[PDB]
Coordinates of C-alpha atoms in Angstrom, one line a residue:
Chain A
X71 CA -18.6 -104.9 -19.1
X72 CA -18.1 -105.0 -15.4
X73 CA -14.7 -102.2 -15.1
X74 CA -16.6 -98.9 -16.1
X75 CA -16.8 -96.9 -12.7
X76 CA -19.0 -94.0 -12.5
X77 CA -17.1 -89.8 -11.6
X78 CA -19.8 -87.3 -10.4
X79 CA -18.7 -84.0 -9.1
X80 CA -22.0 -81.6 -7.9
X81 CA -24.1 -84.0 -8.7
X82 CA -23.2 -84.4 -12.2
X83 CA -21.7 -87.0 -14.2
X84 CA -18.6 -85.7 -15.7
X85 CA -16.5 -88.7 -16.6
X86 CA -15.9 -92.4 -16.1
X87 CA -12.2 -94.6 -15.1
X88 CA -11.4 -98.3 -15.9
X89 CA -9.4 -100.6 -14.4
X90 CA -7.3 -102.5 -16.3
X91 CA -4.4 -105.1 -15.8
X92 CA -2.9 -104.0 -12.5
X93 CA -3.6 -100.7 -12.1
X94 CA -6.5 -98.0 -12.0
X95 CA -6.8 -95.1 -14.8
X96 CA -8.2 -91.8 -14.2
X97 CA -7.7 -89.0 -17.0
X98 CA -5.9 -86.4 -15.0
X99 CA -8.1 -83.5 -16.4
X100 CA -11.8 -85.0 -15.2
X101 CA -13.0 -83.2 -11.9
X102 CA -14.9 -85.2 -9.4
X103 CA -14.7 -87.9 -6.9
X104 CA -15.1 -91.6 -7.3
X105 CA -18.5 -93.5 -6.8
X106 CA -17.0 -96.8 -5.2
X107 CA -15.6 -95.2 -1.0
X108 CA -13.3 -98.3 -1.6
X109 CA -11.3 -96.5 -4.3
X110 CA -11.9 -93.3 -3.1
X111 CA -8.9 -94.0 0.2
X112 CA -6.0 -94.7 -2.9
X113 CA -3.1 -91.9 -3.2
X114 CA -2.8 -90.7 -6.9
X115 CA 0.3 -89.5 -8.7
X116 CA 0.5 -87.1 -11.5
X117 CA 2.4 -86.4 -14.5
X118 CA 0.8 -84.0 -16.9
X119 CA 3.1 -85.0 -19.4
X120 CA 0.7 -87.8 -20.6
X121 CA -2.9 -86.9 -18.7
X122 CA -2.8 -89.7 -16.7
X123 CA -3.2 -90.8 -13.0
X124 CA -2.6 -93.9 -11.8
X125 CA -2.9 -96.3 -8.6
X126 CA -2.2 -99.6 -7.3
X127 CA -5.2 -102.3 -7.6
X128 CA -6.4 -103.4 -4.1
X129 CA -6.2 -106.9 -3.6
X130 CA -9.8 -108.0 -3.1
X131 CA -11.1 -106.5 -6.3
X132 CA -8.5 -108.6 -8.3
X133 CA -11.3 -110.9 -10.2
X134 CA -12.1 -107.7 -11.8
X135 CA -9.3 -107.1 -14.0
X136 CA -9.7 -106.7 -17.7
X137 CA -6.6 -108.6 -20.4
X138 CA -4.7 -106.5 -22.3
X139 CA -2.7 -107.2 -25.3
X140 CA -0.2 -104.5 -27.2
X141 CA -0.7 -106.0 -31.0
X142 CA -2.7 -103.2 -33.2
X143 CA -3.6 -105.0 -36.9
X144 CA -5.4 -103.3 -39.2
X145 CA -8.7 -103.6 -39.0
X146 CA -12.0 -102.8 -37.2
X147 CA -12.8 -102.4 -33.6
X148 CA -15.6 -101.5 -31.4
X149 CA -16.6 -99.8 -28.8
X150 CA -19.6 -98.6 -26.5
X151 CA -21.3 -96.4 -28.8
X152 CA -20.3 -98.8 -32.3
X153 CA -18.2 -99.3 -34.5
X154 CA -14.6 -97.3 -35.2
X155 CA -11.6 -97.5 -37.5
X156 CA -7.9 -97.9 -37.1
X157 CA -5.8 -97.4 -40.4
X158 CA -2.5 -95.1 -41.2
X159 CA -2.2 -94.7 -37.7
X160 CA -5.3 -92.9 -36.9
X161 CA -8.5 -93.8 -35.5
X162 CA -11.8 -92.7 -37.2
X163 CA -15.4 -92.6 -36.1
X164 CA -18.1 -91.3 -37.8
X165 CA -19.4 -87.9 -37.3
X166 CA -22.0 -87.2 -34.4
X167 CA -21.3 -89.7 -31.8
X168 CA -19.9 -88.8 -29.0
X169 CA -20.1 -85.4 -26.4
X170 CA -18.2 -83.6 -23.3
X171 CA -18.4 -86.1 -20.4
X172 CA -17.6 -89.4 -22.4
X173 CA -14.2 -89.6 -21.5
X174 CA -12.3 -93.1 -20.2
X175 CA -14.5 -95.3 -22.1
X176 CA -12.2 -98.6 -23.4
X177 CA -11.5 -99.8 -27.3
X178 CA -12.0 -103.6 -27.4
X179 CA -10.3 -106.2 -29.6
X180 CA -11.9 -108.8 -31.3
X181 CA -11.6 -111.4 -27.8
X182 CA -12.3 -108.6 -25.8
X183 CA -8.8 -107.5 -24.7
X184 CA -8.3 -103.8 -24.2
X185 CA -6.4 -101.5 -26.5
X186 CA -6.7 -97.9 -26.0
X187 CA -8.0 -95.4 -23.2
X188 CA -10.0 -92.2 -25.5
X189 CA -9.9 -88.6 -24.1
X190 CA -10.9 -86.0 -26.7
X191 CA -11.1 -85.8 -30.5
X192 CA -11.1 -83.3 -33.6
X193 CA -13.9 -82.5 -35.7
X194 CA -13.9 -82.6 -39.6
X195 CA -16.0 -82.4 -42.2
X196 CA -17.9 -86.6 -42.1
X197 CA -15.1 -88.2 -39.8
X198 CA -13.9 -87.3 -36.4
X199 CA -10.3 -87.2 -35.7
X200 CA -9.8 -89.2 -32.0
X201 CA -7.3 -88.1 -29.2
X202 CA -6.1 -91.9 -27.8
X203 CA -3.5 -92.8 -24.6
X204 CA -2.5 -96.4 -25.8
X205 CA 0.8 -98.4 -24.3
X206 CA 3.7 -100.1 -25.7
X207 CA 6.2 -102.8 -24.5
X208 CA 7.7 -101.0 -21.6
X209 CA 6.2 -97.4 -22.0
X210 CA 3.6 -95.3 -22.7
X211 CA 2.7 -92.8 -25.9
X212 CA 0.6 -90.1 -26.5
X213 CA -1.2 -89.7 -30.1
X214 CA -3.4 -86.2 -30.9
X215 CA -4.1 -84.8 -33.8
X216 CA -4.3 -81.0 -34.8
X217 CA -7.4 -79.2 -33.7
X218 CA -8.7 -81.6 -31.0
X219 CA -10.9 -80.6 -28.5
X220 CA -11.1 -82.2 -24.8
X221 CA -14.1 -84.0 -24.0
Chain B
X209 CA 52.4 -44.0 12.7
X210 CA 54.9 -43.8 9.5
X211 CA 52.6 -45.8 7.4
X212 CA 49.7 -45.8 5.3
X213 CA 46.4 -48.0 6.7
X214 CA 45.9 -51.2 4.7
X215 CA 42.4 -52.5 2.8
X216 CA 40.0 -55.5 2.7
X217 CA 42.5 -57.3 0.3
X218 CA 45.2 -57.9 2.4
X219 CA 45.2 -60.8 3.8
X220 CA 47.3 -63.3 5.2
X221 CA 49.1 -66.2 2.7
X222 CA 47.4 -69.1 5.5
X223 CA 44.2 -67.7 5.7
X224 CA 43.9 -66.9 1.8
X225 CA 44.0 -70.7 1.0
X226 CA 41.6 -72.2 3.7
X227 CA 39.2 -70.1 1.7
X228 CA 40.3 -71.2 -1.8
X229 CA 39.8 -74.8 -0.6
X230 CA 36.1 -74.1 0.8
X231 CA 34.7 -71.9 -1.9
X232 CA 35.9 -74.7 -4.8
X233 CA 34.4 -77.8 -2.7
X234 CA 31.4 -76.2 -2.4
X235 CA 30.9 -75.3 -6.1
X236 CA 32.0 -78.4 -7.2
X237 CA 28.7 -80.0 -5.6
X238 CA 26.5 -77.9 -7.4
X239 CA 28.2 -78.4 -10.4
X240 CA 28.3 -82.4 -10.5
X241 CA 24.3 -81.9 -9.7
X242 CA 23.9 -79.5 -12.9
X243 CA 24.8 -82.0 -15.4
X244 CA 22.5 -85.1 -14.1
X245 CA 19.7 -82.8 -14.8
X246 CA 20.4 -81.2 -18.4
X247 CA 21.1 -84.8 -19.7
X248 CA 17.7 -86.1 -17.9
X249 CA 15.8 -83.0 -19.3
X250 CA 16.8 -83.9 -23.1
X251 CA 15.5 -87.3 -23.0
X252 CA 12.3 -86.6 -22.3
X253 CA 12.1 -84.1 -25.3
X254 CA 13.4 -86.4 -27.8
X255 CA 11.7 -89.8 -26.4
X256 CA 8.1 -88.2 -27.0
Chain C
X138 CA 27.5 -64.2 9.7
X139 CA 26.5 -62.9 5.8
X140 CA 29.2 -65.6 4.3
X141 CA 28.1 -68.7 6.4
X142 CA 24.5 -68.1 5.2
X143 CA 24.9 -67.9 1.8
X144 CA 27.1 -70.9 1.5
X145 CA 24.3 -73.0 3.0
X146 CA 21.7 -71.9 0.9
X147 CA 23.9 -73.3 -2.1
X148 CA 24.1 -76.5 -0.8
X149 CA 20.5 -76.8 -0.2
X150 CA 20.0 -76.6 -4.0
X151 CA 22.1 -79.3 -4.9
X152 CA 20.3 -81.3 -3.1
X153 CA 16.9 -80.0 -4.0
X154 CA 17.5 -80.7 -8.2
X155 CA 18.6 -84.3 -7.5
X156 CA 15.5 -85.1 -6.2
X157 CA 13.7 -83.2 -9.3
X158 CA 15.9 -85.3 -11.4
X159 CA 14.7 -88.5 -10.0
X160 CA 10.9 -88.3 -9.8
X161 CA 10.9 -87.4 -13.7
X162 CA 13.3 -90.3 -14.2
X163 CA 11.0 -93.0 -13.2
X164 CA 7.3 -92.0 -14.0
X165 CA 7.3 -93.5 -16.7
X166 CA 7.8 -96.9 -16.1
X167 CA 5.0 -97.4 -13.4
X168 CA 1.8 -95.6 -15.3
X169 CA 2.6 -98.6 -18.1
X170 CA 0.2 -101.7 -17.3
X171 CA 2.3 -104.6 -16.5
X172 CA 5.5 -103.4 -16.6
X173 CA 8.6 -104.1 -14.6
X174 CA 11.4 -101.6 -13.9
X175 CA 15.0 -102.8 -15.1
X176 CA 17.3 -104.0 -12.4
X177 CA 20.0 -101.5 -13.2
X178 CA 17.7 -98.4 -13.3
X179 CA 15.9 -99.8 -9.8
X180 CA 18.7 -100.2 -7.7
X181 CA 21.4 -97.6 -8.5
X182 CA 20.5 -94.7 -10.6
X183 CA 16.7 -93.5 -10.4
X184 CA 15.8 -95.7 -7.3

């Protein structure tokens, strides 16, 4: 709830960053600077194979960190604009929700544990195919469906 | 003089040995380093 | 003079390649939340 921060550039909101675990996470393709002046001083490392940048969380903000897991049982999941469905290895959300600039939102489990970070999506007839960056034990992976566009 | 001139390929036996050792040594360093790069590159390709 | 210049450049390429390999080797292990780099790789190779 309190782990969400805004990214602004030239007076407009471009996207979001999220604090999870012990690391700061931000999509690589989003431009701008962070609203909190304290985070602006960190040095960030970039790898285009996953479109992900990360840096170390400072000590005095450790109480704001969210909990996480890796288990992904089939069922229903929740996020800011409504409900999302996970089945068959892909996340599908009804068409009409979402628009450019919504990058960085987390998807939560039943108990409030974070399982995924969303970026972009693909347009179909009655459903939307989402592109997501997840993680597993000791590695991370990227899932991207055909025809997806950046958000 | 009653003999012909010499060319660039005419070098004493002692001098030739030093050239071979130096060029061979430097070449090995490039060869070993090249193999490590190839192994890492394949792992990244396949794992994704 | 020419031979010395070329030989030194070749040595520099060998060093330059090694740092490139190390960067790509390790980076997957640091972006994962809550991850720990394995002992063997942490100390000896892909430091």
